[PDB]
Structure 1
Amino acid sequence: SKGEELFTGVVPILVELDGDVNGHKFSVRGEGEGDATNGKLTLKFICTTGKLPVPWPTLVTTLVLCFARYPDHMKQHDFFKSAMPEGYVQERTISFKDDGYYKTRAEVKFEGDTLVNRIELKGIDFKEDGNILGHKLEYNHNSHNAYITADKQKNGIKSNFKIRHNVEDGSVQLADHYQQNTPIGDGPVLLPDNHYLSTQNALSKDPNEKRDHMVLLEFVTAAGIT
């Protein structure tokens, strides 16, 4: 639909994150490419301030749903692409069970030929000996479904979902996500019927990279509408 023609091929991506968790300031920069026809993302993220003070897996959801594969019968429900190129604001609260929370605010928009995700993150109330600041999470990210609903009052969408992070002792750390997206422009956006996104992620390391970093492969596909 509207905005779909910006995503017909492979698109370069830039991600910039400025973060502060319990007063520990950090910065992350990512680059790679996205292919919405297959729902595929290929990115490499570097911490540009030293060692990341939180586990890389806790930043995956924060670090571009316009690259989701929406099948033909659902093309009228793709809010994310319909907002382009002006883009959208993506805001989340992420509550970690028995621990602190992240608040994130991002702008996702085209800057010329590159899709850019610029994020501010604040982390508050974390336990210095918990799973997050204590670095106790496995280096992976399991698959999740996220239900998308229309926020007709704000011409946007909303979503809430739980991420289950594997803990190195065999337990699970829950991260409860509430999300709200609002268009930056005022043109015709698509407000969808209820549906969901299915996401898979694989995390790896570049052997020739010396900085603290994360190589990320992601697949996102839409479903739930007949």
Structure 2
Amino acid sequence: SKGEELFTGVVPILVELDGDVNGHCFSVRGEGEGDATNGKLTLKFIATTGKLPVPWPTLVTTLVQCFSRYPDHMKRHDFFKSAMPEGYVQERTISFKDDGTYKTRAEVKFEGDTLVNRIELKGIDFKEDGNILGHKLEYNFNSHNVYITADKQKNGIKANFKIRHNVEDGSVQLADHYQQNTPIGDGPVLLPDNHYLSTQSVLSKDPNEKRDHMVLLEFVTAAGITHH
């Protein structure tokens, strides 16, 4: 209750990522704002360490599901907001088909008035001339469903989904996602029935930005529960 009330208006967002893929270290900082009531957010990310060693699209899912629109009839299933402001730890394993793997750990929490997503990413076993290290992925994104289930023993949740990245030669690069979320605080949280998030992402560029960057507009809505 005290959680969801933090999201009734427009909330400033800060994203920070430290990454290491096949021994290539990099950092990303992002800034923007989110409208959870409508399930919309806008962010601009900058590579603070030069040119990214991996394609921007491979980082989209890593780079705040508390901004998902949970319609009124599903309010009892919003784990993400209920964990606020103390927040939650989000851990993922991302397996790129016929290629390497990302392991990520993020803390999503309020720092003052700002919703912060602070991430550690490690990637291993990527192929030098594969789609990722070879930068062969198109600068766009498809819509996906994120399937969520309660992880009661861990007072948290799990999720599974498959990302489809368009490849410049017309092929498709699959990225299998496993996700788990655990509260940072020791207070009670909502543990949901099985459901999913429907996500759309629009990638663009800032014409006035000289640094390697990504502009992102996201739409997310929760579903998978029959209405009455």
| Corresponding residue of 1:140 | 140
Q: For each residue in 1:151-171, what CA deviation from the matched residue of structure 2 results, as whole angstroms up to 9, or x when unmatched?
A: 011000000100000001110
Q: CA deviation at 1:79?
A: 0.1
Q: CA deviation at 1:2?
A: 4.3
Q: Please show how residues 9-158 of structure 1 align to structure 2 within 5 Å.
A: 9-158=9-158
| Corresponding residue of 1:183 | 183
**Any unmatched runs of 5+ in structure 1?**
none
Q: For each residue in 1:93-132, what CA deviation from the matched residue of structure 2 results, as whole angstroms up to 9, or x when unmatched?
A: 0000000000000000000100000000000000010000
CA distance in 2, matches of 1:156, 1:48: 33
Number of positions where the alignment pairs a residue of Structure 1 with one of Structure 2: 226
1:116–1:34 CA distance, 2 compared to 1 (3 A): same
CA distance in 1, matches of 2:2, 2:198: 23
Q: For each residue in 1:184-208, what CA deviation from the matched residue of structure 2 results, as whole angstroms up to 9, or x when unmatched?
A: 0111200000011000000000000
- 3-state DSSP of counterpart to 2:13: strand
Q: For each residue in 1:7-52, what CA deviation from the matched residue of structure 2 results, as whole angstroms up to 9, or x when unmatched?
A: 0000000000000000000000000000001101100000000001
| Corresponding residue of 2:213 | 213
**Any unmatched runs of 5+ in structure 2?**
none
Q: CA deviation at 1:224?
A: 1.3
Q: For each residue in 1:41-75, what CA deviation from the matched residue of structure 2 results, as whole angstroms up to 9, or x when unmatched?
A: 10000000000110000000000000000000000
- 3-state DSSP of counterpart to 1:180: strand
Q: Could you tell me the percent identity over the aligned residues? A: 95
1:193–1:2 CA distance, 2 compared to 1 (3 A): farther
Q: State the superposition RMSD in angstroms.
A: 0.6
CA distance in 2, matches of 1:17, 1:224: 31
CA distance in 1, matches of 2:184, 2:50: 33
CA distance in 2, matches of 1:155, 1:134: 40
CA distance in 2, matches of 1:146, 1:23: 30
Instruction: List structure 1 runs of 4+ shifted beyond 4 angstroms.
Output: none
- 3-state DSSP of counterpart to 1:153: helix
CA distance in 2, matches of 1:148, 1:136: 30
TM superposition score normalised by structure 2? 0.98
CA distance in 1, matches of 2:165, 2:62: 14
CA distance in 2, matches of 1:98, 1:224: 31
CA distance in 1, matches of 2:47, 2:170: 27
